[PDB]
Short mmCIF file of N, CA and C and ligand atoms in Angstrom, two decimals:
data_model
loop_
_atom_site.label_atom_id
_atom_site.label_comp_id
_atom_site.label_asym_id
_atom_site.label_seq_id
_atom_site.Cartn_x
_atom_site.Cartn_y
_atom_site.Cartn_z
N UNK A 1 87.65 -31.46 118.36
CA UNK A 1 87.55 -32.19 119.69
C UNK A 1 86.16 -32.87 119.84
N UNK A 2 86.02 -33.77 120.75
CA UNK A 2 84.77 -34.48 121.09
C UNK A 2 84.47 -34.36 122.60
N UNK A 3 84.66 -33.14 123.17
CA UNK A 3 84.53 -32.81 124.61
C UNK A 3 83.16 -32.26 124.95
N UNK A 4 82.35 -31.93 123.93
CA UNK A 4 81.06 -31.27 124.06
C UNK A 4 80.13 -32.00 125.05
N UNK A 5 80.22 -33.33 125.13
CA UNK A 5 79.36 -34.20 126.01
C UNK A 5 79.64 -34.08 127.50
N UNK A 6 80.74 -33.43 127.87
CA UNK A 6 81.05 -33.09 129.30
C UNK A 6 80.57 -31.70 129.61
N UNK A 7 79.63 -31.13 128.81
CA UNK A 7 79.10 -29.76 128.99
C UNK A 7 78.53 -29.61 130.38
N UNK A 8 78.78 -28.46 131.01
CA UNK A 8 78.28 -28.13 132.37
C UNK A 8 77.66 -26.73 132.25
N UNK A 9 76.62 -26.47 133.07
CA UNK A 9 75.91 -25.18 133.04
C UNK A 9 76.57 -24.29 134.11
N UNK A 10 77.30 -23.29 133.64
CA UNK A 10 78.06 -22.42 134.54
C UNK A 10 77.18 -21.18 134.78
N UNK A 11 77.20 -20.73 136.01
CA UNK A 11 76.57 -19.43 136.38
C UNK A 11 77.61 -18.58 137.13
N UNK A 12 77.46 -17.27 137.03
CA UNK A 12 78.44 -16.34 137.68
C UNK A 12 78.05 -16.12 139.16
N UNK A 13 79.03 -15.97 139.98
CA UNK A 13 78.84 -15.71 141.44
C UNK A 13 79.07 -14.20 141.68
N UNK A 14 77.91 -13.47 141.85
CA UNK A 14 77.83 -12.00 142.13
C UNK A 14 78.81 -11.58 143.24
N UNK A 15 78.89 -12.42 144.24
CA UNK A 15 79.66 -12.08 145.50
C UNK A 15 81.13 -11.91 145.23
N UNK A 16 81.67 -12.59 144.20
CA UNK A 16 83.08 -12.55 143.85
C UNK A 16 83.41 -11.40 142.87
N UNK A 17 82.41 -10.78 142.30
CA UNK A 17 82.60 -9.80 141.25
C UNK A 17 83.29 -8.51 141.74
N UNK A 18 84.18 -7.95 140.98
CA UNK A 18 84.57 -6.54 141.13
C UNK A 18 83.31 -5.73 141.16
N UNK A 19 83.34 -4.64 141.96
CA UNK A 19 82.15 -3.86 142.25
C UNK A 19 81.68 -3.04 141.06
N UNK A 20 82.41 -2.94 139.97
CA UNK A 20 81.96 -2.29 138.71
C UNK A 20 81.27 -3.19 137.76
N UNK A 21 81.21 -4.49 138.04
CA UNK A 21 80.64 -5.46 137.09
C UNK A 21 79.10 -5.48 137.23
N UNK A 22 78.46 -5.70 136.12
CA UNK A 22 76.97 -5.94 136.02
C UNK A 22 76.77 -7.36 135.50
N UNK A 23 76.18 -8.19 136.34
CA UNK A 23 75.86 -9.58 136.01
C UNK A 23 74.39 -9.68 135.68
N UNK A 24 74.04 -10.31 134.61
CA UNK A 24 72.64 -10.40 134.18
C UNK A 24 71.79 -11.21 135.19
N UNK A 25 70.45 -11.01 135.09
CA UNK A 25 69.48 -11.73 135.97
C UNK A 25 69.74 -13.28 135.97
N UNK A 26 70.00 -13.80 134.80
CA UNK A 26 70.16 -15.26 134.59
C UNK A 26 71.59 -15.72 135.02
N UNK A 27 72.43 -14.76 135.44
CA UNK A 27 73.77 -15.08 135.89
C UNK A 27 74.58 -15.76 134.78
N UNK A 28 74.34 -15.43 133.52
CA UNK A 28 75.03 -16.00 132.40
C UNK A 28 75.81 -14.96 131.62
N UNK A 29 75.69 -13.66 131.88
CA UNK A 29 76.41 -12.56 131.13
C UNK A 29 76.99 -11.60 132.19
N UNK A 30 78.12 -11.00 131.81
CA UNK A 30 78.76 -9.97 132.70
C UNK A 30 79.39 -8.94 131.80
N UNK A 31 79.26 -7.66 132.20
CA UNK A 31 79.93 -6.58 131.49
C UNK A 31 80.38 -5.53 132.53
N UNK A 32 81.32 -4.69 132.10
CA UNK A 32 81.82 -3.59 132.93
C UNK A 32 80.79 -2.43 132.92
N UNK A 33 80.43 -1.97 134.07
CA UNK A 33 79.56 -0.80 134.25
C UNK A 33 80.31 0.47 134.15
N UNK A 34 79.62 1.59 134.01
CA UNK A 34 80.29 2.92 133.75
C UNK A 34 80.58 3.53 135.16
N UNK A 35 80.35 2.83 136.25
CA UNK A 35 80.58 3.34 137.63
C UNK A 35 80.55 2.19 138.66
N UNK A 36 80.78 2.43 139.96
CA UNK A 36 80.51 1.43 141.04
C UNK A 36 79.03 1.02 141.03
N UNK A 37 78.80 -0.28 141.15
CA UNK A 37 77.46 -0.85 140.97
C UNK A 37 76.66 -0.95 142.32
N UNK A 38 77.03 -0.20 143.33
CA UNK A 38 76.17 0.02 144.49
C UNK A 38 76.00 -1.26 145.32
N UNK A 39 77.06 -2.06 145.44
CA UNK A 39 77.15 -3.27 146.29
C UNK A 39 78.08 -3.00 147.44
N UNK A 40 77.92 -3.76 148.55
CA UNK A 40 78.88 -3.71 149.69
C UNK A 40 80.18 -4.40 149.31
N UNK A 41 81.31 -4.04 149.93
CA UNK A 41 82.63 -4.72 149.77
C UNK A 41 82.58 -6.01 150.58
N UNK A 42 83.40 -6.97 150.20
CA UNK A 42 83.53 -8.24 150.99
C UNK A 42 84.89 -8.81 150.58
N UNK A 43 85.36 -9.85 151.29
CA UNK A 43 86.75 -10.32 151.13
C UNK A 43 86.83 -11.17 149.84
N UNK A 44 85.70 -11.57 149.22
CA UNK A 44 85.69 -12.38 148.01
C UNK A 44 85.96 -11.52 146.77
N UNK A 45 85.59 -10.24 146.76
CA UNK A 45 85.59 -9.44 145.49
C UNK A 45 86.99 -9.19 144.97
N UNK A 46 87.21 -9.39 143.66
CA UNK A 46 88.47 -8.98 143.04
C UNK A 46 88.50 -7.41 143.04
N UNK A 47 89.48 -6.82 143.68
CA UNK A 47 89.52 -5.36 143.84
C UNK A 47 90.17 -4.63 142.67
N UNK A 48 91.24 -5.15 142.10
CA UNK A 48 92.12 -4.35 141.18
C UNK A 48 91.73 -4.53 139.71
N UNK A 49 90.94 -5.58 139.39
CA UNK A 49 90.69 -5.92 138.01
C UNK A 49 89.22 -6.31 137.85
N UNK A 50 88.65 -6.26 136.64
CA UNK A 50 87.26 -6.50 136.40
C UNK A 50 86.92 -8.01 136.26
N UNK A 51 87.20 -8.75 137.34
CA UNK A 51 87.17 -10.24 137.40
C UNK A 51 85.93 -10.71 138.16
N UNK A 52 85.52 -11.96 137.87
CA UNK A 52 84.43 -12.64 138.58
C UNK A 52 84.67 -14.18 138.44
N UNK A 53 84.21 -14.95 139.41
CA UNK A 53 84.24 -16.40 139.35
C UNK A 53 82.87 -17.00 138.98
N UNK A 54 82.89 -18.21 138.42
CA UNK A 54 81.69 -19.04 138.41
C UNK A 54 81.35 -19.54 139.78
N UNK A 55 80.09 -19.90 139.98
CA UNK A 55 79.59 -20.41 141.26
C UNK A 55 80.04 -21.86 141.43
N UNK A 56 80.21 -22.57 140.36
CA UNK A 56 80.49 -24.05 140.43
C UNK A 56 81.91 -24.22 140.94
N UNK A 57 82.12 -25.29 141.78
CA UNK A 57 83.46 -25.74 142.20
C UNK A 57 83.68 -27.15 141.66
N UNK A 58 84.83 -27.43 141.11
CA UNK A 58 85.15 -28.73 140.47
C UNK A 58 86.37 -29.36 141.20
N UNK A 59 86.27 -30.57 141.63
CA UNK A 59 87.40 -31.28 142.34
C UNK A 59 87.68 -32.65 141.75
N UNK A 60 86.87 -33.03 140.70
CA UNK A 60 87.07 -34.32 139.95
C UNK A 60 86.44 -34.18 138.57
N UNK A 61 86.70 -35.16 137.72
CA UNK A 61 85.96 -35.34 136.45
C UNK A 61 86.41 -34.43 135.29
N UNK A 62 85.60 -34.48 134.27
CA UNK A 62 85.80 -33.74 133.02
C UNK A 62 84.66 -32.76 132.92
N UNK A 63 84.96 -31.51 132.58
CA UNK A 63 83.99 -30.39 132.45
C UNK A 63 84.30 -29.59 131.17
N UNK A 64 83.29 -29.05 130.56
CA UNK A 64 83.41 -28.29 129.31
C UNK A 64 82.39 -27.18 129.31
N UNK A 65 82.78 -25.97 128.96
CA UNK A 65 81.82 -24.85 128.75
C UNK A 65 82.34 -23.93 127.65
N UNK A 66 81.48 -23.00 127.19
CA UNK A 66 81.81 -22.09 126.08
C UNK A 66 81.45 -20.67 126.44
N UNK A 67 82.30 -19.75 126.07
CA UNK A 67 82.11 -18.34 126.33
C UNK A 67 82.17 -17.50 125.05
N UNK A 68 81.24 -16.58 124.89
CA UNK A 68 81.17 -15.65 123.74
C UNK A 68 81.98 -14.38 124.08
N UNK A 69 82.91 -14.03 123.21
CA UNK A 69 83.82 -12.87 123.36
C UNK A 69 83.65 -11.88 122.19
N UNK A 70 82.54 -12.00 121.46
CA UNK A 70 82.30 -11.16 120.24
C UNK A 70 82.58 -9.68 120.52
N UNK A 71 83.33 -9.07 119.64
CA UNK A 71 83.68 -7.61 119.53
C UNK A 71 84.40 -7.12 120.81
N UNK A 72 84.94 -7.95 121.67
CA UNK A 72 85.79 -7.43 122.75
C UNK A 72 87.26 -7.25 122.30
N UNK A 73 87.92 -6.24 122.81
CA UNK A 73 89.33 -5.90 122.58
C UNK A 73 90.24 -6.61 123.60
N UNK A 74 89.72 -6.93 124.76
CA UNK A 74 90.56 -7.47 125.90
C UNK A 74 89.64 -8.32 126.79
N UNK A 75 90.20 -9.41 127.30
CA UNK A 75 89.58 -10.35 128.27
C UNK A 75 90.56 -11.42 128.69
N UNK A 76 90.27 -12.03 129.81
CA UNK A 76 91.01 -13.25 130.27
C UNK A 76 89.94 -14.34 130.49
N UNK A 77 90.22 -15.63 130.20
CA UNK A 77 89.29 -16.74 130.47
C UNK A 77 90.13 -17.94 130.94
N UNK A 78 89.50 -18.70 131.84
CA UNK A 78 89.98 -20.05 132.10
C UNK A 78 89.37 -20.55 133.43
N UNK A 79 90.30 -21.15 134.25
CA UNK A 79 89.93 -21.63 135.63
C UNK A 79 90.97 -21.11 136.63
N UNK A 80 90.58 -21.15 137.89
CA UNK A 80 91.52 -20.87 138.93
C UNK A 80 91.18 -21.62 140.20
N UNK A 81 92.17 -21.72 141.09
CA UNK A 81 91.96 -22.25 142.47
C UNK A 81 90.87 -21.45 143.16
N UNK A 82 90.10 -22.11 144.00
CA UNK A 82 89.14 -21.36 144.84
C UNK A 82 89.87 -20.40 145.79
N UNK A 83 91.10 -20.68 146.14
CA UNK A 83 91.83 -19.88 147.13
C UNK A 83 92.71 -18.78 146.53
N UNK A 84 92.58 -18.45 145.24
CA UNK A 84 93.42 -17.38 144.67
C UNK A 84 93.23 -16.07 145.44
N UNK A 85 94.32 -15.29 145.45
CA UNK A 85 94.33 -13.91 145.93
C UNK A 85 93.20 -13.07 145.25
N UNK A 86 92.53 -12.23 146.00
CA UNK A 86 91.43 -11.37 145.50
C UNK A 86 91.86 -9.92 145.47
N UNK A 87 92.70 -9.51 146.43
CA UNK A 87 93.04 -8.06 146.66
C UNK A 87 94.40 -7.70 146.19
N UNK A 88 94.54 -6.48 145.63
CA UNK A 88 95.86 -5.99 145.19
C UNK A 88 96.27 -6.55 143.86
N UNK A 89 97.50 -6.34 143.52
CA UNK A 89 98.08 -6.66 142.20
C UNK A 89 98.64 -8.09 142.21
N UNK A 90 98.48 -8.79 141.12
CA UNK A 90 99.03 -10.15 140.92
C UNK A 90 99.04 -10.51 139.45
N UNK A 91 99.84 -11.45 139.02
CA UNK A 91 99.93 -11.94 137.64
C UNK A 91 99.15 -13.25 137.51
N UNK A 92 98.55 -13.46 136.38
CA UNK A 92 97.85 -14.70 136.08
C UNK A 92 98.87 -15.75 135.68
N UNK A 93 99.11 -16.74 136.55
CA UNK A 93 100.15 -17.77 136.32
C UNK A 93 99.72 -19.04 137.05
N UNK A 94 100.13 -20.19 136.65
CA UNK A 94 99.89 -21.42 137.42
C UNK A 94 100.44 -21.30 138.84
N UNK A 95 101.61 -20.66 139.00
CA UNK A 95 102.21 -20.49 140.38
C UNK A 95 101.21 -19.79 141.28
N UNK A 96 100.42 -18.84 140.75
CA UNK A 96 99.40 -18.09 141.56
C UNK A 96 98.03 -18.73 141.53
N UNK A 97 97.88 -19.92 140.91
CA UNK A 97 96.62 -20.65 140.89
C UNK A 97 95.68 -20.33 139.75
N UNK A 98 96.22 -19.92 138.58
CA UNK A 98 95.34 -19.55 137.42
C UNK A 98 95.82 -20.33 136.18
N UNK A 99 94.91 -20.86 135.40
CA UNK A 99 95.14 -21.51 134.11
C UNK A 99 94.25 -20.81 133.08
N UNK A 100 94.88 -19.86 132.38
CA UNK A 100 94.07 -18.85 131.59
C UNK A 100 94.75 -18.56 130.23
N UNK A 101 93.94 -18.00 129.34
CA UNK A 101 94.42 -17.35 128.08
C UNK A 101 93.79 -15.96 128.11
N UNK A 102 94.32 -15.08 127.20
CA UNK A 102 93.80 -13.75 127.12
C UNK A 102 94.02 -13.18 125.73
N UNK A 103 93.23 -12.11 125.51
CA UNK A 103 93.43 -11.15 124.34
C UNK A 103 93.85 -9.84 124.95
N UNK A 104 94.88 -9.23 124.37
CA UNK A 104 95.37 -7.89 124.79
C UNK A 104 96.10 -7.27 123.60
N UNK A 105 95.68 -6.07 123.21
CA UNK A 105 96.44 -5.34 122.16
C UNK A 105 96.65 -6.17 120.97
N UNK A 106 95.60 -6.79 120.43
CA UNK A 106 95.63 -7.47 119.14
C UNK A 106 96.52 -8.79 119.18
N UNK A 107 96.91 -9.25 120.36
CA UNK A 107 97.58 -10.58 120.42
C UNK A 107 96.89 -11.47 121.44
N UNK A 108 96.92 -12.75 121.20
CA UNK A 108 96.41 -13.79 122.13
C UNK A 108 97.62 -14.46 122.85
N UNK A 109 97.56 -14.64 124.15
CA UNK A 109 98.67 -15.22 124.93
C UNK A 109 98.12 -16.16 126.02
N UNK A 110 98.84 -17.23 126.30
CA UNK A 110 98.53 -18.13 127.41
C UNK A 110 99.24 -17.58 128.66
N UNK A 111 98.54 -17.64 129.78
CA UNK A 111 99.00 -17.17 131.10
C UNK A 111 100.04 -18.07 131.77
N UNK A 112 101.09 -18.42 131.13
CA UNK A 112 102.24 -19.03 131.73
C UNK A 112 103.15 -17.93 132.25
N UNK A 113 104.22 -18.27 132.97
CA UNK A 113 105.16 -17.28 133.50
C UNK A 113 106.57 -17.61 133.03
N UNK A 114 107.10 -16.86 132.03
CA UNK A 114 106.42 -15.74 131.35
C UNK A 114 105.38 -16.20 130.32
N UNK A 115 104.61 -15.29 129.87
CA UNK A 115 103.42 -15.64 128.98
C UNK A 115 103.89 -16.21 127.64
N UNK A 116 103.02 -17.01 127.08
CA UNK A 116 103.31 -17.73 125.77
C UNK A 116 102.48 -17.12 124.69
N UNK A 117 103.03 -16.74 123.53
CA UNK A 117 102.34 -16.33 122.33
C UNK A 117 101.48 -17.46 121.72
N UNK A 118 100.24 -17.18 121.44
CA UNK A 118 99.29 -18.09 120.80
C UNK A 118 99.25 -17.79 119.28
N UNK A 119 98.97 -18.76 118.51
CA UNK A 119 99.00 -18.64 117.01
C UNK A 119 97.56 -18.89 116.57
N UNK A 120 96.82 -17.86 116.37
CA UNK A 120 95.34 -17.95 116.02
C UNK A 120 95.15 -17.31 114.64
N UNK A 121 94.74 -18.07 113.67
CA UNK A 121 94.54 -17.52 112.27
C UNK A 121 93.13 -16.86 112.20
N UNK A 122 92.17 -17.41 112.91
CA UNK A 122 90.74 -16.98 112.82
C UNK A 122 90.34 -16.38 114.19
N UNK A 123 90.32 -15.05 114.37
CA UNK A 123 90.01 -14.48 115.70
C UNK A 123 88.72 -15.11 116.20
N UNK A 124 88.73 -15.69 117.41
CA UNK A 124 87.56 -16.36 117.94
C UNK A 124 86.48 -15.44 118.38
N UNK A 125 85.21 -15.78 118.12
CA UNK A 125 84.00 -15.15 118.69
C UNK A 125 83.51 -15.98 119.88
N UNK A 126 83.80 -17.27 119.93
CA UNK A 126 83.46 -18.12 121.10
C UNK A 126 84.57 -19.13 121.40
N UNK A 127 84.87 -19.30 122.65
CA UNK A 127 86.03 -20.08 123.23
C UNK A 127 85.41 -21.23 123.94
N UNK A 128 85.89 -22.44 123.70
CA UNK A 128 85.57 -23.60 124.55
C UNK A 128 86.65 -23.91 125.54
N UNK A 129 86.30 -24.19 126.78
CA UNK A 129 87.21 -24.51 127.88
C UNK A 129 86.93 -25.91 128.38
N UNK A 130 87.96 -26.72 128.37
CA UNK A 130 87.90 -28.17 128.79
C UNK A 130 88.85 -28.37 129.97
N UNK A 131 88.35 -28.93 131.05
CA UNK A 131 89.12 -29.32 132.28
C UNK A 131 89.00 -30.81 132.50
N UNK A 132 90.14 -31.48 132.60
CA UNK A 132 90.23 -32.89 133.05
C UNK A 132 90.97 -32.85 134.38
N UNK A 133 90.24 -32.94 135.49
CA UNK A 133 90.85 -32.77 136.83
C UNK A 133 91.90 -33.83 137.15
N UNK A 134 91.51 -35.10 136.89
CA UNK A 134 92.42 -36.18 137.24
C UNK A 134 93.65 -36.12 136.35
N UNK A 135 93.52 -35.83 135.04
CA UNK A 135 94.67 -35.78 134.15
C UNK A 135 95.54 -34.55 134.34
N UNK A 136 95.09 -33.48 135.05
CA UNK A 136 95.81 -32.24 135.20
C UNK A 136 95.91 -31.54 133.87
N UNK A 137 94.78 -31.36 133.15
CA UNK A 137 94.73 -30.73 131.82
C UNK A 137 93.68 -29.60 131.79
N UNK A 138 94.07 -28.43 131.26
CA UNK A 138 93.12 -27.38 130.86
C UNK A 138 93.39 -27.05 129.35
N UNK A 139 92.35 -27.17 128.52
CA UNK A 139 92.52 -26.91 127.09
C UNK A 139 91.49 -25.86 126.64
N UNK A 140 91.89 -25.11 125.61
CA UNK A 140 91.10 -24.03 125.03
C UNK A 140 90.95 -24.32 123.57
N UNK A 141 89.71 -24.07 123.07
CA UNK A 141 89.31 -24.43 121.68
C UNK A 141 88.67 -23.21 121.04
N UNK A 142 88.90 -23.08 119.69
CA UNK A 142 88.38 -21.93 118.89
C UNK A 142 87.06 -22.39 118.26
N UNK A 143 85.89 -22.05 118.75
CA UNK A 143 84.63 -22.61 118.27
C UNK A 143 84.34 -21.99 116.91
N UNK A 144 84.82 -20.76 116.65
CA UNK A 144 84.62 -20.04 115.37
C UNK A 144 85.33 -20.82 114.23
N UNK A 145 86.47 -21.46 114.53
CA UNK A 145 87.32 -22.21 113.60
C UNK A 145 87.15 -23.74 113.81
N UNK A 146 85.89 -24.22 113.83
CA UNK A 146 85.59 -25.68 113.81
C UNK A 146 86.23 -26.36 115.01
N UNK A 147 86.38 -25.63 116.12
CA UNK A 147 86.88 -26.27 117.36
C UNK A 147 88.38 -26.44 117.40
N UNK A 148 89.18 -25.74 116.60
CA UNK A 148 90.65 -25.99 116.56
C UNK A 148 91.25 -25.69 117.92
N UNK A 149 92.30 -26.42 118.24
CA UNK A 149 93.05 -26.24 119.54
C UNK A 149 93.73 -24.89 119.52
N UNK A 150 93.56 -24.16 120.64
CA UNK A 150 94.30 -22.92 120.93
C UNK A 150 95.50 -23.19 121.82
N UNK A 151 95.25 -23.88 122.94
CA UNK A 151 96.34 -24.10 123.97
C UNK A 151 95.91 -25.17 124.92
N UNK A 152 96.88 -25.98 125.35
CA UNK A 152 96.76 -27.01 126.40
C UNK A 152 97.79 -26.75 127.48
N UNK A 153 97.32 -26.51 128.72
CA UNK A 153 98.11 -26.63 129.93
C UNK A 153 98.09 -28.12 130.40
N UNK A 154 99.23 -28.74 130.46
CA UNK A 154 99.29 -30.09 131.00
C UNK A 154 100.19 -30.12 132.21
N UNK A 155 100.21 -31.30 132.93
CA UNK A 155 100.95 -31.41 134.19
C UNK A 155 100.50 -30.36 135.20
N UNK A 156 99.20 -29.96 135.14
CA UNK A 156 98.69 -28.94 136.03
C UNK A 156 98.71 -29.44 137.50
N UNK A 157 99.09 -28.57 138.42
CA UNK A 157 99.05 -28.90 139.85
C UNK A 157 97.89 -28.02 140.43
N UNK A 158 96.66 -28.50 140.37
CA UNK A 158 95.49 -27.72 140.75
C UNK A 158 95.59 -27.31 142.24
N UNK A 159 95.88 -28.27 143.06
CA UNK A 159 96.08 -28.14 144.51
C UNK A 159 94.88 -27.58 145.25
N UNK A 160 93.69 -27.80 144.74
CA UNK A 160 92.45 -27.33 145.35
C UNK A 160 91.29 -27.46 144.47
N UNK A 161 90.10 -27.12 144.88
CA UNK A 161 88.91 -27.02 144.01
C UNK A 161 89.17 -25.92 142.99
N UNK A 162 88.59 -26.12 141.83
CA UNK A 162 88.70 -25.15 140.71
C UNK A 162 87.38 -24.43 140.54
N UNK A 163 87.48 -23.16 140.11
CA UNK A 163 86.32 -22.33 139.71
C UNK A 163 86.52 -21.79 138.33
N UNK A 164 85.45 -21.67 137.53
CA UNK A 164 85.55 -20.94 136.26
C UNK A 164 85.93 -19.51 136.52
N UNK A 165 86.83 -18.92 135.71
CA UNK A 165 87.45 -17.64 135.92
C UNK A 165 87.16 -16.74 134.68
N UNK A 166 86.85 -15.46 134.92
CA UNK A 166 86.51 -14.47 133.86
C UNK A 166 87.14 -13.13 134.19
N UNK A 167 87.59 -12.48 133.14
CA UNK A 167 87.96 -11.00 133.23
C UNK A 167 87.35 -10.34 132.00
N UNK A 168 86.49 -9.36 132.21
CA UNK A 168 85.86 -8.64 131.06
C UNK A 168 86.85 -7.63 130.45
N UNK A 169 87.92 -7.35 131.16
CA UNK A 169 88.91 -6.36 130.74
C UNK A 169 88.51 -4.96 131.04
N UNK A 170 89.54 -4.09 130.95
CA UNK A 170 89.47 -2.62 131.06
C UNK A 170 88.67 -2.02 129.93
N UNK A 171 88.00 -0.87 130.10
CA UNK A 171 87.38 -0.20 128.95
C UNK A 171 87.90 1.27 128.93
N UNK A 172 89.18 1.42 129.00
CA UNK A 172 89.80 2.80 128.82
C UNK A 172 89.54 3.33 127.42
N UNK A 173 89.45 2.49 126.37
CA UNK A 173 89.42 2.81 124.96
C UNK A 173 88.00 3.18 124.52
N UNK A 174 87.01 2.76 125.32
CA UNK A 174 85.61 2.84 124.81
C UNK A 174 85.28 1.76 123.79
N UNK A 175 86.17 0.85 123.46
CA UNK A 175 85.93 -0.17 122.45
C UNK A 175 85.80 -1.58 123.08
N UNK A 176 85.75 -1.68 124.42
CA UNK A 176 85.66 -2.97 125.09
C UNK A 176 84.54 -3.10 126.07
N UNK A 177 83.39 -2.43 125.78
CA UNK A 177 82.19 -2.51 126.65
C UNK A 177 81.41 -3.78 126.51
N UNK A 178 81.60 -4.55 125.44
CA UNK A 178 80.75 -5.73 125.19
C UNK A 178 80.90 -6.73 126.30
N UNK A 179 79.81 -7.52 126.57
CA UNK A 179 79.86 -8.52 127.65
C UNK A 179 80.63 -9.84 127.28
N UNK A 180 81.03 -10.56 128.33
CA UNK A 180 81.24 -12.01 128.20
C UNK A 180 79.90 -12.70 128.36
N UNK A 181 79.61 -13.72 127.60
CA UNK A 181 78.36 -14.48 127.73
C UNK A 181 78.63 -15.97 127.80
N UNK A 182 78.08 -16.67 128.72
CA UNK A 182 78.08 -18.16 128.73
C UNK A 182 77.13 -18.68 127.71
N UNK A 183 77.60 -19.46 126.74
CA UNK A 183 76.76 -19.92 125.59
C UNK A 183 75.96 -21.10 125.96
N UNK A 184 74.74 -21.30 125.39
CA UNK A 184 73.89 -22.42 125.74
C UNK A 184 74.53 -23.70 125.15
N UNK A 185 74.30 -24.79 125.91
CA UNK A 185 74.50 -26.24 125.63
C UNK A 185 73.70 -26.63 124.39
C1 LIG B 201 86.68 -1.10 136.69
C2 LIG B 201 88.17 -1.05 136.43
C3 LIG B 201 89.07 -1.82 137.14
CL1 LIG B 201 88.46 -2.97 138.33
C4 LIG B 201 90.45 -1.78 136.90
C5 LIG B 201 90.92 -0.83 136.01
C6 LIG B 201 90.05 -0.06 135.27
C7 LIG B 201 88.68 -0.12 135.52
N1 LIG B 201 87.80 0.68 134.74
C8 LIG B 201 87.83 0.82 133.42
O1 LIG B 201 88.38 0.02 132.67
C9 LIG B 201 87.02 1.91 132.80
C10 LIG B 201 87.93 3.01 132.23
C11 LIG B 201 87.97 4.06 133.35
C12 LIG B 201 86.61 3.94 133.90
O2 LIG B 201 86.20 2.54 133.80
#
């Protein structure tokens, strides 16, 4: 791809984080803590899952950023509506305002309803995310494999401002403590 020139500097929004997340001082890294992180509750926080939003809101144009997923067993990445549900149980789907991919149990899947199997030959250590607001496109790229396409959501009905979306995943196994990191431009 040749999307790198629409690069945007994403930072994480502490106020949206599940209360067990630890966001770095530079707001570019997030990991699951081994307990509640001593913050007050608020209506923005994702309650049921280890999720957080980027601070930036996008309502036009082309945007591109990259995320490091090295040595994680589970995660979700993409974009979502600013108005997505925060509390209780929900599925990641375009109907619920999410355009995402994930790793779970040694398989990669796109967050369609029902979910779509991804075909990845080279497990990615860094993921590129491209949004074209006007075109209604969200695309994912394998930076480890020379930028190869992972998945394109097209005919997207955003229906609102978009925010970068992250899930560090559960760490029941003890093998998923590693952070998500926003990679430099
Ligand atoms: C923080 C969290 C949410 Cl939000 C949802 C489900 C699980 C967890 N916690 C973990 O994955 C690990 C394993 C048990 C102790 O923490």
